A paper describes a structure:
The crystals belonged to the space group P212121, with two molecules per asymmetric unit, and diffracted to a 2.48 Å resolution. In agreement with light-scattering experiment results, the two molecules in the asymmetric unit form a tightly associated dimer characterised by a buried surface area of approximately 4366 Å2 and many hydrogen bonds and van der Waals interactions at the interface between subunits. The dimer formation produces an extended β-sheet core consisting of ten β–strands, where the N-terminal helix of each monomer extends around the other monomer. There are two active sites per dimer, which are located in clefts at the dimeric interface. Each active site contains a zinc ion on the bottom, which is coordinated by three protein residues, Cys37, His96 and Cys99. In one of the two active sites, a water molecule is clearly visible in the fourth coordination position (Figure 4(B,C)), whereas in the other active site, this water molecule is not visible, probably due to the lower quality of the electron density maps in this region. Our crystallographic analysis clearly indicates that TvaCA1 belongs to the type I subclass. Indeed, even if the water molecule in the fourth coordination position is clearly visible only in one active site of the dimer, the aspartic acid residue, which is coordinated to the zinc ion in Type II β-CAs (Asp39 in the TvaCA1 sequence), is in both TvaCA1 active sites, very well defined in the electron density maps and far from the catalytic metal, leaving the active site in the open conformation. As observed for other β-CAs so far structurally characterised, the TvaCA1 active site is located in a narrow cavity spanning from the protein surface to the catalytic zinc ion. The comparison between the TvaCA1 catalytic cavity and that of human CAs showed significant differences in dimensions, being the latter much larger and more accessible.
Numbering used by the authors:
A (entry chain B), B (entry chain A): 1 to 182
Write the structure that this text describes.
């Protein structure tokens, strides 16, 4: 059985076990956006750890949960949609210990790409841009502090929207407040 | 209680109820990456719907789960890290019906920003770039098909990594295969 088949299969079983679900509002009912990491350990974990339930928040996830730009990015656009289209009033940026964006570099990714038959010329072309995500990621806490700053100083983001910074431990699920944005 | 206080509070309760949890591998154990939407309705839902458990996959989320670029983005970088650093062998891009990005436009976001006291000059500066996310998002299915294409044609992504396209219904949780990438 392929991974697709397993998903198809699991979905069938899911629909059987969940025959009639209540329609939820499309807008987050706590008016909050969470930005966090793609880390496998946070899946079906992080939200329970912060007491966030289905229908309550938008959740935005990328490797290292970073905003290093004050222009636009996938994450930034997600926040604009959250605020302006979906009524979000608070942003929580939540990094995690042992992120492994910490010990990821353009060198190591480059090496891996070469192994995978990626053209060296292509690796060089993108190395500089890629650096902005993986090499600038020094430390989880620093990244949180910096990310909270970059969202704040974004000219498209209203001054009356608090931006908080949190750190979650991927094993224990302990959350520690880094920045209170009120 | 503020939203931060609620989170702090819930975390305390979470740690009490979950005193000692088994450490999981930092790498996804099914070697799969899921790209999906930030939609409030998919939180604590989408993963169960596809039978994906904690520790099995990386999950990447942005408004409209779109890859329109063959350069770099938050989503793309997340996929590179997944494959090269974390051993991911398959990518599933999963859009949803009633996506908020369909009826989001630069006009509507602009209007909202103007309301919020954002400088008109700033709105005009970003309008062209912003267009690439919100205006190009025509239809969920078309976005899935196009996103699967843009990941495929990305020169940094190996040819031997299948890219699948799925559609989930945000109410029922029914998943339908759009593209099989094997
Ligand atoms: Zn991480
Ligand atoms: Zn959506």
């Amino acid at each position: 059985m392929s991974q697709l088949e397993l998903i198809t299969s699991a979905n069938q079983a899911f629909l059987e076990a969940n025959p009639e679900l209540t329609k939820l509002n499309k807008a987050p009912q706590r008016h909050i956006a969470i930005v966090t990491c793609m880390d496998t350990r946070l899946v079906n974990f992080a939200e329970d750890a912060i007491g966030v339930k289905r229908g309550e928040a938008t959740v935005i996830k990328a490797a290292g949960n970073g905003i290093w730009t004050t222009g636009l990015s996938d994450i930034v656009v997600s926040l604009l949609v959250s605020i302006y289209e979906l009524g979000v009033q608070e942003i929580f940026i939540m990094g995690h210990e042992c992120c492994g964006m910490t010990h990821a570099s353009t060198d190591s990714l480059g090496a891996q790409m070469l192994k995978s038959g990626i053209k060296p010329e292509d690796i060089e072309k993108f190395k500089s841009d890629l650096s902005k995500w993986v090499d600038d990621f020094k430390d989880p806490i620093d990244n949180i502090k910096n990310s909270v700053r970059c969202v704040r100083e974004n000219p498209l983001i209203p001054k009356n929207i608090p931006i908080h910074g949190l750190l979650i431990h991927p094993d224990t699920g302990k959350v520690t407040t880094i920045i209170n944005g009120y």
